[model samples]
Target: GSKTKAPSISIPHDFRCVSAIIDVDIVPETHRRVRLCKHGSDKPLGFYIRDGTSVRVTASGLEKQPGIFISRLVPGGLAESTGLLAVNDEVIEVNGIEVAGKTLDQVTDMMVANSSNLIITVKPANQR
Candidate 1:
């Protein structure tokens, strides 16, 4: 159930904005210790993205640890190829939908199905 204050927002499909805010980290791989790539190539990587092209981000007090966590995201998924996103660039909205109390599956569906060339906005908070 959505609280009166943190109301759940609806996000529509066909959203082409940058809805994913990736937070990159390094972790050590046990078996991949090559002489050339051993020094700076062993570490875990993860991303922390919001729900929409226009969605506000709220801290959940969850710390990102090592290991691959899909929570909902798939492994080995390719990004925009161009890498236009940056750290701290939270997705503030999507298409025209505000994402609040939405499940990761719900939001990820939009991004995977997005076709429009929209920019996903990001912010720390939003209006009540």
Candidate 2:
């Protein structure tokens, strides 16, 4: 189909950068799916992917109680240093993917396959 082409948005000339360009990749071959249980409940914990750059800050979606679902506990990430999230905190959701309604393995597969930019909404334990 033929169509008229509109002008593309230029970054440096048109607008300010909204997000930092961190080199993050989900290596499908190496990433592993593991189950982490707390308070007798098992949760899906995704690991082994590489987020190459230093993460300056982190935000949880929680504006209220039960606000965050923690995952991908990168050993040295900003999320770890903050210690705002504890191991027992339930990961109620991920990248719009709900945790409560899914199985451990099912959620792990989704994360392993995701290569695009992601916005994960989370709630901190204090909120709950």
After superposition on all C-alphas, the RMSD of every candidate to the true structure, in Å, is: 16.1, 16.0
> How big is the positional error of residue 3 in model 1, measured in Å on the Cα after superposition?
18
Q: Give the C-alpha lDDT of model 2.
A: 0.34
Q: What is the lDDT of residue 43 in candidate 2?
A: 30
**All candidates: TM-score:** 0.31, 0.36
lDDT of 2 by residue, 1-128 (tens): 32312123222332222222121233121111221212222232323222122112238533333222443565653334345444434444344465443555655665443323232323333432
Candidate that would win on TM-score? 2
lDDT of 1 by residue, 1-128 (tens): 32222113334443233333322122122111101011132222223453333322249654432221122222432222323333333433433333454455654454334323222333322121
